[PDB]
Amino acid sequence: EFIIRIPPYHYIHVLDQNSNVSRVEVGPKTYIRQDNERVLFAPMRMVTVPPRHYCTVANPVSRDAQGLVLFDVTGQVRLRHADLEIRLAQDPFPLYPGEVLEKDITPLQVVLPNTALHLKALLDFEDKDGDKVVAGDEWLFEGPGTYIPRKEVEVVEIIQATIIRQNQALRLRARKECWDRDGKERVTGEEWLVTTVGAYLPAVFEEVLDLVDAVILTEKTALHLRARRNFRDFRGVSRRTGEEW
Amino acid sequence: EFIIRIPPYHYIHVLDQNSNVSRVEVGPKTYIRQDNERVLFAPMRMVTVPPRHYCTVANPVSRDAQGLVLFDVTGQVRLRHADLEIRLAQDPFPLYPGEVLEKDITPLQVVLPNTALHLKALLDFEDKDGDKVVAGDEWLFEGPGTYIPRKEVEVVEIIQATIIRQNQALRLRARKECWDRDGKERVTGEEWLVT
Amino acid sequence: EFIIRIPPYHYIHVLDQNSNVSRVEVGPKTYIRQDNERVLFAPMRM
């Protein structure tokens, strides 16, 4: 149990009981241990993440400007505690001591056309575009692209588009005080209708209620309407609460 | 078990336990092993892919500008991990250590007239015509030709033609915001007729 | 039987079965043999 052969693309961890500092032995080697040392476990293949895939390793090692691993003065590997890393496709890295595999190799999930991902920031951070994204903000990553996960950013759900045909309105009610595509104030609880034909993605703060189709008018027909509140109609004529036309 | 004869057009793999690096012995030979070495398995015929056929080998070896195989400093064969190769008809190549056969020799499927193949890009790549095909795009390979598979390009389905006689229209509804043969805008859900 | 420690002021002989040529390992060492090799006898004081 002193001589131990590590296949190519594998590793082990051995602890030196003089300083009680641990390390990793990587490579295609035949390994010879001392008597003061102990090998921790039986050889494990160093994990490989294919292209268009992903993994999260809890408590990543620290790095320098070149990206090299940092050790302690005692010889122990430098870690980052209660912290995670974003590991995309690369060469078969080994896991060091005190490195945990949080999520296995998983497939990067691709966003379909006419849909969007609802992503909220868990912890504050700085944005790719130069912005500061305070924790608790709401986004939409939409389009047909691929989404690369982040640590402090969590995906809440995916939202489909709703289809608006000709002569329809699709009423929307606000989750909170907000703004709208048409560029005008909305408040909590207020409702409105977005006429535009096509497919529609609601914002994070907007919600879809129901589709409302037009009433068709002829020479033998009219439409009896009552005002919910004071407003202006499409003729531009003013309407007080309650009055009918 | 020291003397071992490999028939013509075959191979084996033997591991050298000094460096623990493995290799392949190819050719019509009688092979004599050392005592430190070990032969891994009993002789296997090196696979031959006929013409108009295909195979995928997981984790292909690396190559140089001449196409020669690359080894490590330790003597181990250089590989490409979680990667695939497009192997068409050629001479009976051997499989090196750490080479897996993903799909056997299969027939190249030929596209009939008045039909088309629906092919979507799994991973981004660059196109034969000089284009950059972002992953998730949709194509049609149509006509009577033969389709040579690719690694990052996957075939979703085959679509038949529909026949339009005289005095008929054939209504079509759009999957997503798009364009049309007649060269005019369409939107999601819109319908039209192609005379 | 691969790892073998030779006390100070001793020796052993090991045969390499590739060339079938033999030699001697002298000194205060811990000795690690290959698999193709064989140690001939148990350590003897020089």
Short mmCIF file of C-alpha atoms in Angstrom, two decimals:
data_model
loop_
_atom_site.label_atom_id
_atom_site.label_comp_id
_atom_site.label_asym_id
_atom_site.label_seq_id
_atom_site.Cartn_x
_atom_site.Cartn_y
_atom_site.Cartn_z
CA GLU A 1 0.00 0.00 0.00
CA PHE A 2 3.06 2.22 -0.41
CA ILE A 3 3.27 1.88 -4.19
CA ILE A 4 0.22 3.22 -6.02
CA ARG A 5 -0.18 3.81 -9.76
CA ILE A 6 -2.44 6.63 -10.96
CA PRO A 7 -3.78 6.14 -14.51
CA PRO A 8 -3.51 8.99 -17.02
CA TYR A 9 -6.00 11.80 -16.49
CA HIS A 10 -6.71 11.01 -12.84
CA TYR A 11 -5.61 12.18 -9.41
CA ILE A 12 -5.50 11.44 -5.68
CA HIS A 13 -5.03 13.40 -2.46
CA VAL A 14 -2.37 12.58 0.14
CA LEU A 15 -2.00 14.13 3.61
CA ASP A 16 1.38 14.85 5.19
CA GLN A 17 1.01 14.22 8.91
CA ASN A 18 4.04 16.33 9.85
CA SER A 19 2.40 19.63 9.00
CA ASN A 20 -1.10 18.14 8.53
CA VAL A 21 -1.37 19.95 5.18
CA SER A 22 -2.91 18.19 2.20
CA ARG A 23 -2.36 18.26 -1.54
CA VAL A 24 -3.13 16.53 -4.84
CA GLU A 25 -1.05 14.25 -7.08
CA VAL A 26 -2.01 14.70 -10.74
CA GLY A 27 -0.78 13.00 -13.88
CA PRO A 28 0.00 9.65 -15.48
CA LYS A 29 2.36 8.46 -12.73
CA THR A 30 3.37 5.60 -10.53
CA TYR A 31 3.33 7.10 -7.06
CA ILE A 32 5.45 6.06 -4.08
CA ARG A 33 4.31 7.30 -0.69
CA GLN A 34 6.34 7.75 2.46
CA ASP A 35 5.43 6.29 5.84
CA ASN A 36 4.51 9.59 7.47
CA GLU A 37 2.10 10.27 4.60
CA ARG A 38 -1.33 8.79 3.87
CA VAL A 39 -3.32 8.60 0.64
CA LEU A 40 -6.89 9.71 1.25
CA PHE A 41 -8.99 7.79 -1.28
CA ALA A 42 -8.71 5.45 -4.28
CA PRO A 43 -7.96 7.10 -7.66
CA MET A 44 -10.74 9.25 -9.15
CA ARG A 45 -11.00 10.45 -12.74
CA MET A 46 -10.57 14.19 -12.95
CA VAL A 47 -13.89 15.53 -14.16
CA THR A 48 -14.31 16.67 -17.77
CA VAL A 49 -17.01 19.15 -18.77
CA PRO A 50 -17.80 18.83 -22.50
CA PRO A 51 -18.52 21.83 -24.73
CA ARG A 52 -21.87 23.61 -24.33
CA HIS A 53 -21.99 22.35 -20.74
CA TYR A 54 -21.50 23.58 -17.21
CA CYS A 55 -20.60 22.74 -13.62
CA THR A 56 -20.45 24.50 -10.24
CA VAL A 57 -17.65 23.71 -7.77
CA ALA A 58 -18.26 24.88 -4.21
CA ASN A 59 -15.34 26.58 -2.47
CA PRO A 60 -13.02 27.22 -5.43
CA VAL A 61 -9.29 27.67 -5.00
CA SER A 62 -7.83 31.15 -5.17
CA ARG A 63 -5.80 32.30 -8.16
CA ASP A 64 -3.18 34.87 -9.11
CA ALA A 65 -3.09 37.29 -12.05
CA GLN A 66 -1.82 34.46 -14.25
CA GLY A 67 -4.53 32.16 -12.89
CA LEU A 68 -2.17 29.91 -10.93
CA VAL A 69 -3.29 28.20 -7.74
CA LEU A 70 -2.26 29.77 -4.43
CA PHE A 71 -0.96 27.82 -1.43
CA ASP A 72 -0.55 28.76 2.21
CA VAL A 73 2.76 29.18 3.99
CA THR A 74 2.00 25.79 5.55
CA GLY A 75 1.50 24.38 2.05
CA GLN A 76 -2.28 24.13 2.22
CA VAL A 77 -4.29 25.17 -0.83
CA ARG A 78 -5.85 28.63 -0.66
CA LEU A 79 -9.64 28.49 -0.84
CA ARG A 80 -12.64 30.80 -1.13
CA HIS A 81 -15.25 29.89 1.46
CA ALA A 82 -19.02 29.75 0.90
CA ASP A 83 -18.20 30.82 -2.65
CA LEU A 84 -18.93 29.27 -6.04
CA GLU A 85 -17.33 29.33 -9.48
CA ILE A 86 -18.65 29.23 -13.04
CA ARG A 87 -16.87 26.38 -14.83
CA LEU A 88 -17.57 26.10 -18.54
CA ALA A 89 -15.91 23.75 -21.03
CA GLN A 90 -12.16 23.31 -20.53
CA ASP A 91 -9.41 20.77 -19.93
CA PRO A 92 -9.88 18.07 -17.26
CA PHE A 93 -9.11 20.09 -14.15
CA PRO A 94 -8.64 18.18 -10.87
CA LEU A 95 -10.49 18.89 -7.62
CA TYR A 96 -8.16 19.98 -4.81
CA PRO A 97 -8.68 19.21 -1.10
CA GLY A 98 -11.70 21.01 0.28
CA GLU A 99 -13.21 21.36 -3.20
CA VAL A 100 -16.80 20.14 -3.48
CA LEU A 101 -18.73 19.49 -6.70
CA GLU A 102 -21.96 21.45 -6.31
CA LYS A 103 -23.67 20.63 -9.62
CA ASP A 104 -22.54 17.90 -12.00
CA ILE A 105 -21.92 18.46 -15.67
CA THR A 106 -25.29 19.72 -16.90
CA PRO A 107 -26.39 20.98 -20.32
CA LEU A 108 -26.52 24.69 -20.97
CA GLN A 109 -30.22 25.39 -21.55
CA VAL A 110 -30.93 27.38 -24.71
CA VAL A 111 -33.70 29.96 -24.99
CA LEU A 112 -36.25 29.28 -27.71
CA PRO A 113 -37.70 31.97 -30.01
CA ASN A 114 -40.69 33.91 -28.67
CA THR A 115 -39.86 33.18 -25.04
CA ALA A 116 -37.77 34.66 -22.23
CA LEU A 117 -36.00 33.78 -18.99
CA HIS A 118 -36.99 35.52 -15.76
CA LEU A 119 -33.78 36.10 -13.80
CA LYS A 120 -33.40 37.82 -10.41
CA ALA A 121 -30.13 38.87 -8.77
CA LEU A 122 -29.55 37.04 -5.49
CA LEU A 123 -26.44 38.98 -4.46
CA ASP A 124 -25.35 42.42 -5.62
CA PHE A 125 -22.82 42.58 -8.43
CA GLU A 126 -21.67 44.65 -11.40
CA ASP A 127 -23.12 44.17 -14.86
CA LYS A 128 -21.50 43.32 -18.19
CA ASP A 129 -22.73 46.60 -19.69
CA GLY A 130 -21.16 48.71 -16.93
CA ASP A 131 -24.13 48.76 -14.56
CA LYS A 132 -24.44 47.99 -10.86
CA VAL A 133 -27.20 45.43 -10.32
CA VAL A 134 -28.40 45.71 -6.73
CA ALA A 135 -29.56 42.40 -5.29
CA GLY A 136 -33.28 41.89 -5.79
CA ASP A 137 -33.55 43.33 -9.30
CA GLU A 138 -35.56 41.67 -12.07
CA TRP A 139 -34.47 40.99 -15.65
CA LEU A 140 -35.61 39.33 -18.84
CA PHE A 141 -33.10 37.48 -20.99
CA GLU A 142 -35.08 36.98 -24.18
CA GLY A 143 -34.51 35.94 -27.76
CA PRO A 144 -33.22 32.65 -29.18
CA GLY A 145 -29.83 32.79 -27.46
CA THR A 146 -28.07 30.56 -24.96
CA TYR A 147 -27.96 31.50 -21.28
CA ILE A 148 -24.67 31.02 -19.42
CA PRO A 149 -25.48 30.77 -15.69
CA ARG A 150 -23.99 33.03 -13.06
CA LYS A 151 -23.38 32.61 -9.34
CA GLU A 152 -25.27 35.56 -7.85
CA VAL A 153 -28.00 35.49 -10.53
CA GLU A 154 -30.88 33.02 -10.31
CA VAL A 155 -33.48 32.12 -12.94
CA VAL A 156 -37.03 32.35 -11.61
CA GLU A 157 -38.98 31.00 -14.59
CA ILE A 158 -39.50 31.12 -18.34
CA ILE A 159 -42.30 33.21 -19.85
CA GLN A 160 -43.94 32.45 -23.19
CA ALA A 161 -45.21 35.05 -25.60
CA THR A 162 -48.93 35.60 -26.02
CA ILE A 163 -50.26 35.92 -29.57
CA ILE A 164 -52.26 39.01 -30.55
CA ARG A 165 -54.15 38.77 -33.84
CA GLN A 166 -55.95 41.51 -35.73
CA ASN A 167 -58.78 43.29 -33.83
CA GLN A 168 -57.63 42.24 -30.34
CA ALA A 169 -56.20 44.05 -27.31
CA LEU A 170 -54.75 41.75 -24.56
CA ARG A 171 -55.29 43.58 -21.23
CA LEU A 172 -52.35 43.78 -18.77
CA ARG A 173 -52.29 44.57 -15.03
CA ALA A 174 -49.19 45.92 -13.23
CA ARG A 175 -47.45 43.93 -10.45
CA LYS A 176 -45.97 47.14 -9.02
CA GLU A 177 -45.43 50.77 -9.92
CA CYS A 178 -43.78 50.61 -13.31
CA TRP A 179 -43.36 51.88 -16.84
CA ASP A 180 -44.68 50.66 -20.18
CA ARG A 181 -43.52 50.15 -23.76
CA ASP A 182 -45.57 53.10 -24.89
CA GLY A 183 -43.45 55.16 -22.51
CA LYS A 184 -46.03 56.31 -19.97
CA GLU A 185 -46.48 56.02 -16.22
CA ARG A 186 -48.33 53.12 -14.64
CA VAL A 187 -49.08 52.44 -10.97
CA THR A 188 -49.85 49.38 -8.89
CA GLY A 189 -53.14 47.76 -9.84
CA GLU A 190 -53.69 49.86 -12.97
CA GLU A 191 -54.73 48.05 -16.14
CA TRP A 192 -54.33 48.80 -19.85
CA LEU A 193 -54.43 47.15 -23.29
CA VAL A 194 -51.57 46.63 -25.76
CA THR A 195 -53.03 46.66 -29.29
CA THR A 196 -49.98 45.71 -31.48
CA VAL A 197 -50.35 42.56 -33.60
CA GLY A 198 -47.82 39.75 -33.35
CA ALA A 199 -46.35 37.94 -30.36
CA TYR A 200 -45.91 39.76 -27.07
CA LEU A 201 -43.54 39.21 -24.16
CA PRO A 202 -44.80 40.74 -20.91
CA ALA A 203 -42.28 42.59 -18.79
CA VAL A 204 -41.23 41.38 -15.33
CA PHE A 205 -43.71 43.74 -13.69
CA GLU A 206 -46.51 43.30 -16.22
CA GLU A 207 -48.87 40.36 -16.15
CA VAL A 208 -51.21 38.98 -18.80
CA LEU A 209 -54.90 38.81 -17.87
CA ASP A 210 -56.96 37.95 -20.97
CA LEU A 211 -57.47 38.55 -24.68
CA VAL A 212 -60.26 40.94 -25.70
CA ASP A 213 -61.54 40.90 -29.27
CA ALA A 214 -63.39 43.71 -31.01
CA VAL A 215 -67.14 44.02 -31.38
CA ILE A 216 -68.17 44.23 -35.02
CA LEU A 217 -70.61 47.03 -35.86
CA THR A 218 -73.00 47.15 -38.82
CA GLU A 219 -75.84 49.33 -40.07
CA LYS A 220 -78.33 47.33 -38.01
CA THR A 221 -76.43 47.44 -34.72
CA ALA A 222 -74.92 49.70 -32.09
CA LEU A 223 -72.96 49.25 -28.89
CA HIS A 224 -74.10 50.48 -25.48
CA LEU A 225 -71.19 51.53 -23.28
CA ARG A 226 -70.94 52.92 -19.73
CA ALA A 227 -67.99 54.75 -18.22
CA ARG A 228 -66.09 52.94 -15.46
CA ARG A 229 -64.33 56.19 -14.59
CA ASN A 230 -63.58 59.56 -16.16
CA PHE A 231 -61.58 59.20 -19.36
CA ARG A 232 -61.21 60.01 -23.05
CA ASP A 233 -62.34 57.75 -25.87
CA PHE A 234 -61.06 57.30 -29.41
CA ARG A 235 -63.27 60.07 -30.79
CA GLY A 236 -61.48 62.33 -28.33
CA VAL A 237 -64.77 63.02 -26.56
CA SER A 238 -64.62 63.23 -22.77
CA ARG A 239 -66.57 60.75 -20.66
CA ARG A 240 -67.59 61.25 -17.03
CA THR A 241 -68.18 58.44 -14.57
CA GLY A 242 -71.46 56.63 -15.12
CA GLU A 243 -72.71 58.35 -18.26
CA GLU A 244 -73.79 56.26 -21.22
CA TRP A 245 -73.64 56.52 -24.99
CA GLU B 1 1.62 -15.45 -23.15
CA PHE B 2 4.75 -13.49 -24.06
CA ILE B 3 4.68 -14.35 -27.75
CA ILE B 4 1.58 -13.09 -29.56
CA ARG B 5 0.95 -12.98 -33.31
CA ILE B 6 -1.24 -10.22 -34.75
CA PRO B 7 -2.85 -11.11 -38.11
CA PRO B 8 -2.62 -8.64 -40.99
CA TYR B 9 -4.92 -5.64 -40.70
CA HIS B 10 -5.41 -5.89 -36.94
CA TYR B 11 -4.02 -4.33 -33.78
CA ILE B 12 -3.69 -4.58 -30.00
CA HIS B 13 -2.90 -2.23 -27.11
CA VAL B 14 -0.11 -2.85 -24.59
CA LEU B 15 0.58 -0.88 -21.40
CA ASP B 16 4.10 -0.15 -20.15
CA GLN B 17 3.96 -0.25 -16.36
CA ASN B 18 7.14 1.78 -15.92
CA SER B 19 5.61 5.04 -17.11
CA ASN B 20 2.02 3.70 -17.15
CA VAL B 21 1.61 5.05 -20.69
CA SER B 22 -0.23 3.00 -23.29
CA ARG B 23 0.06 2.54 -27.04
CA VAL B 24 -1.01 0.43 -30.01
CA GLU B 25 0.78 -2.24 -32.05
CA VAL B 26 -0.41 -2.23 -35.67
CA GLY B 27 0.52 -4.41 -38.61
CA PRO B 28 1.01 -7.98 -39.78
CA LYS B 29 3.50 -8.92 -37.05
CA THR B 30 4.53 -11.52 -34.55
CA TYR B 31 4.80 -9.57 -31.31
CA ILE B 32 7.06 -10.33 -28.36
CA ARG B 33 6.23 -8.58 -25.10
CA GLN B 34 8.49 -7.82 -22.19
CA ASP B 35 7.76 -8.76 -18.58
CA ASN B 36 7.12 -5.23 -17.37
CA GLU B 37 4.54 -4.80 -20.15
CA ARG B 38 1.00 -6.17 -20.45
CA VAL B 39 -1.21 -6.67 -23.50
CA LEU B 40 -4.67 -5.28 -22.82
CA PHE B 41 -7.04 -7.40 -24.93
CA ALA B 42 -7.09 -10.13 -27.59
CA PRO B 43 -6.49 -8.99 -31.20
CA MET B 44 -9.26 -6.90 -32.80
CA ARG B 45 -9.72 -6.19 -36.50
CA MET B 46 -9.12 -2.53 -37.24
CA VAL B 47 -12.44 -1.18 -38.42
CA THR B 48 -13.05 -0.51 -42.12
CA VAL B 49 -15.70 1.97 -43.27
CA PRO B 50 -16.76 1.20 -46.87
CA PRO B 51 -17.48 3.91 -49.44
CA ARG B 52 -20.70 5.92 -49.09
CA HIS B 53 -20.63 5.16 -45.35
CA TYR B 54 -19.84 6.82 -42.07
CA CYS B 55 -18.73 6.41 -38.45
CA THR B 56 -18.26 8.60 -35.37
CA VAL B 57 -15.34 7.99 -32.99
CA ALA B 58 -15.64 9.66 -29.60
CA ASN B 59 -12.52 11.40 -28.29
CA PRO B 60 -10.39 11.50 -31.45
CA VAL B 61 -6.62 11.79 -31.32
CA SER B 62 -5.00 15.13 -32.06
CA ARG B 63 -3.13 15.75 -35.30
CA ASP B 64 -0.46 18.00 -36.76
CA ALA B 65 -0.46 20.00 -40.00
CA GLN B 66 0.51 16.83 -41.87
CA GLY B 67 -2.20 14.90 -40.04
CA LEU B 68 0.17 12.79 -37.93
CA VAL B 69 -0.81 11.60 -34.47
CA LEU B 70 0.53 13.53 -31.49
CA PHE B 71 1.94 11.93 -28.34
CA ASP B 72 2.65 13.33 -24.89
CA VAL B 73 6.09 13.78 -23.40
CA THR B 74 5.28 10.69 -21.34
CA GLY B 75 4.46 8.86 -24.57
CA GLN B 76 0.70 8.84 -24.14
CA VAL B 77 -1.47 9.58 -27.17
CA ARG B 78 -2.84 13.12 -27.38
CA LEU B 79 -6.64 13.18 -27.30
CA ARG B 80 -9.53 15.60 -27.72
CA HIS B 81 -12.00 15.20 -24.87
CA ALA B 82 -15.79 15.21 -25.17
CA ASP B 83 -15.18 15.74 -28.88
CA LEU B 84 -16.21 13.80 -31.97
CA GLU B 85 -14.86 13.30 -35.47
CA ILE B 86 -16.43 12.80 -38.89
CA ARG B 87 -14.92 9.64 -40.38
CA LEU B 88 -15.89 8.90 -43.97
CA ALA B 89 -14.53 6.15 -46.22
CA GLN B 90 -10.78 5.57 -45.89
CA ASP B 91 -8.12 2.98 -45.12
CA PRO B 92 -8.54 0.69 -42.08
CA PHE B 93 -7.46 3.06 -39.33
CA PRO B 94 -6.85 1.58 -35.86
CA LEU B 95 -8.43 2.83 -32.63
CA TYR B 96 -5.86 4.14 -30.15
CA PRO B 97 -6.15 3.91 -26.34
CA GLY B 98 -8.97 6.05 -25.03
CA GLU B 99 -10.71 6.02 -28.43
CA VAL B 100 -14.36 4.98 -28.31
CA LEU B 101 -16.54 4.02 -31.28
CA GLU B 102 -19.64 6.20 -30.97
CA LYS B 103 -21.62 5.04 -34.02
CA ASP B 104 -20.79 1.96 -36.06
CA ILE B 105 -20.40 1.99 -39.81
CA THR B 106 -23.78 3.27 -40.99
CA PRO B 107 -25.06 4.12 -44.48
CA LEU B 108 -25.05 7.71 -45.61
CA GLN B 109 -28.74 8.54 -46.06
CA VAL B 110 -29.57 10.12 -49.41
CA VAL B 111 -32.22 12.80 -49.86
CA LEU B 112 -34.99 11.91 -52.31
CA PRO B 113 -36.46 14.35 -54.85
CA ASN B 114 -39.25 16.62 -53.61
CA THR B 115 -38.20 16.34 -49.97
CA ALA B 116 -35.86 18.06 -47.53
CA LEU B 117 -33.91 17.52 -44.32
CA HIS B 118 -34.59 19.73 -41.30
CA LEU B 119 -31.22 20.38 -39.65
CA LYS B 120 -30.52 22.51 -36.56
CA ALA B 121 -27.10 23.58 -35.29
CA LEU B 122 -26.37 22.17 -31.83
CA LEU B 123 -23.11 24.05 -31.27
CA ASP B 124 -21.94 27.24 -32.96
CA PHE B 125 -19.60 26.87 -35.92
CA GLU B 126 -18.56 28.45 -39.21
CA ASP B 127 -20.27 27.60 -42.47
CA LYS B 128 -18.93 26.22 -45.75
CA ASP B 129 -20.11 29.33 -47.61
CA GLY B 130 -18.25 31.70 -45.27
CA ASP B 131 -21.03 32.24 -42.74
CA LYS B 132 -21.12 31.99 -38.96
CA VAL B 133 -23.96 29.69 -37.90
CA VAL B 134 -24.89 30.52 -34.32
CA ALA B 135 -26.11 27.51 -32.36
CA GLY B 136 -29.87 27.15 -32.56
CA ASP B 137 -30.32 28.12 -36.21
CA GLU B 138 -32.60 26.22 -38.59
CA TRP B 139 -31.79 25.01 -42.10
CA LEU B 140 -33.23 23.01 -44.96
CA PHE B 141 -30.98 20.74 -46.99
CA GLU B 142 -33.20 19.93 -49.95
CA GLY B 143 -32.93 18.39 -53.37
CA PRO B 144 -31.91 14.88 -54.41
CA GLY B 145 -28.40 15.04 -52.94
CA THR B 146 -26.59 13.07 -50.27
CA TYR B 147 -26.17 14.49 -46.77
CA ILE B 148 -22.78 14.07 -45.08
CA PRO B 149 -23.34 14.37 -41.30
CA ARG B 150 -21.56 16.87 -39.11
CA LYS B 151 -20.72 16.92 -35.41
CA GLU B 152 -22.35 20.15 -34.23
CA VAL B 153 -25.27 19.87 -36.69
CA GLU B 154 -28.24 17.63 -35.95
CA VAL B 155 -31.05 16.54 -38.26
CA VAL B 156 -34.49 17.15 -36.76
CA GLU B 157 -36.70 15.53 -39.40
CA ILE B 158 -37.49 15.18 -43.09
CA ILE B 159 -40.28 17.21 -44.69
CA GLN B 160 -42.18 16.11 -47.79
CA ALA B 161 -43.48 18.43 -50.46
CA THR B 162 -47.19 19.13 -50.71
CA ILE B 163 -48.75 19.05 -54.17
CA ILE B 164 -50.66 22.09 -55.44
CA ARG B 165 -52.78 21.52 -58.55
CA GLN B 166 -54.57 24.09 -60.68
CA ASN B 167 -57.17 26.26 -58.87
CA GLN B 168 -55.84 25.63 -55.35
CA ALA B 169 -54.11 27.74 -52.69
CA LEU B 170 -52.58 25.74 -49.74
CA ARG B 171 -52.80 28.04 -46.67
CA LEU B 172 -49.69 28.39 -44.45
CA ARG B 173 -49.33 29.67 -40.86
CA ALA B 174 -46.05 31.07 -39.47
CA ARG B 175 -44.22 29.38 -36.56
CA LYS B 176 -42.49 32.65 -35.68
CA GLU B 177 -41.83 36.09 -37.10
CA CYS B 178 -40.43 35.38 -40.53
CA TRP B 179 -40.20 36.14 -44.22
CA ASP B 180 -41.81 34.56 -47.27
CA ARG B 181 -40.93 33.51 -50.82
CA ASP B 182 -42.91 36.40 -52.20
CA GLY B 183 -40.52 38.63 -50.28
CA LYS B 184 -42.86 40.26 -47.76
CA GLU B 185 -43.06 40.50 -43.98
CA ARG B 186 -44.94 37.95 -41.91
CA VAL B 187 -45.46 37.82 -38.14
CA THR B 188 -46.23 35.12 -35.61
CA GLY B 189 -49.66 33.57 -36.12
CA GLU B 190 -50.32 35.26 -39.47
CA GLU B 191 -51.66 33.11 -42.29
CA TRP B 192 -51.49 33.33 -46.09
CA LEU B 193 -51.92 31.25 -49.26
CA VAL B 194 -49.26 30.23 -51.80
CA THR B 195 -50.96 29.87 -55.21
CA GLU C 1 8.08 -6.88 -2.44
CA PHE C 2 8.63 -3.89 -4.72
CA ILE C 3 9.82 -1.54 -1.99
CA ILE C 4 13.01 -2.68 -0.27
CA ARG C 5 15.19 -0.70 2.14
CA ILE C 6 18.94 -1.36 2.23
CA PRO C 7 20.61 -0.39 5.54
CA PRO C 8 23.77 1.72 5.47
CA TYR C 9 26.91 -0.17 4.46
CA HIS C 10 25.10 -3.01 2.70
CA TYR C 11 24.13 -4.00 -0.84
CA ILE C 12 21.96 -6.23 -3.02
CA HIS C 13 21.98 -7.49 -6.61
CA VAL C 14 19.06 -7.03 -9.02
CA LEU C 15 18.70 -8.58 -12.49
CA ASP C 16 17.10 -6.72 -15.40
CA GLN C 17 15.24 -9.31 -17.46
CA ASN C 18 15.16 -7.16 -20.60
CA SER C 19 18.87 -7.49 -21.29
CA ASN C 20 19.46 -10.20 -18.65
CA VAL C 21 22.38 -8.16 -17.28
CA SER C 22 22.90 -7.88 -13.54
CA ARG C 23 24.25 -5.22 -11.22
CA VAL C 24 24.58 -4.12 -7.59
CA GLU C 25 22.76 -1.47 -5.54
CA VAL C 26 25.05 0.00 -2.88
CA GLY C 27 24.43 2.59 -0.20
CA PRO C 28 22.09 3.68 2.58
CA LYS C 29 18.95 3.75 0.40
CA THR C 30 15.33 2.84 0.16
CA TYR C 31 15.11 0.96 -3.12
CA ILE C 32 12.10 0.73 -5.44
CA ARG C 33 12.20 -2.01 -8.06
CA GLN C 34 10.36 -2.20 -11.34
CA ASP C 35 8.22 -5.13 -12.45
CA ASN C 36 10.58 -6.35 -15.15
CA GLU C 37 13.39 -6.47 -12.57
CA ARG C 38 14.06 -8.97 -9.78
CA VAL C 39 16.13 -8.65 -6.61
CA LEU C 40 18.37 -11.69 -6.23
CA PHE C 41 18.83 -12.13 -2.47
CA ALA C 42 18.08 -10.47 0.88
CA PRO C 43 20.44 -7.63 1.93
CA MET C 44 24.01 -8.65 2.83
CA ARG C 45 26.55 -6.55 4.72
CA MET C 46 29.41 -5.55 2.47
#
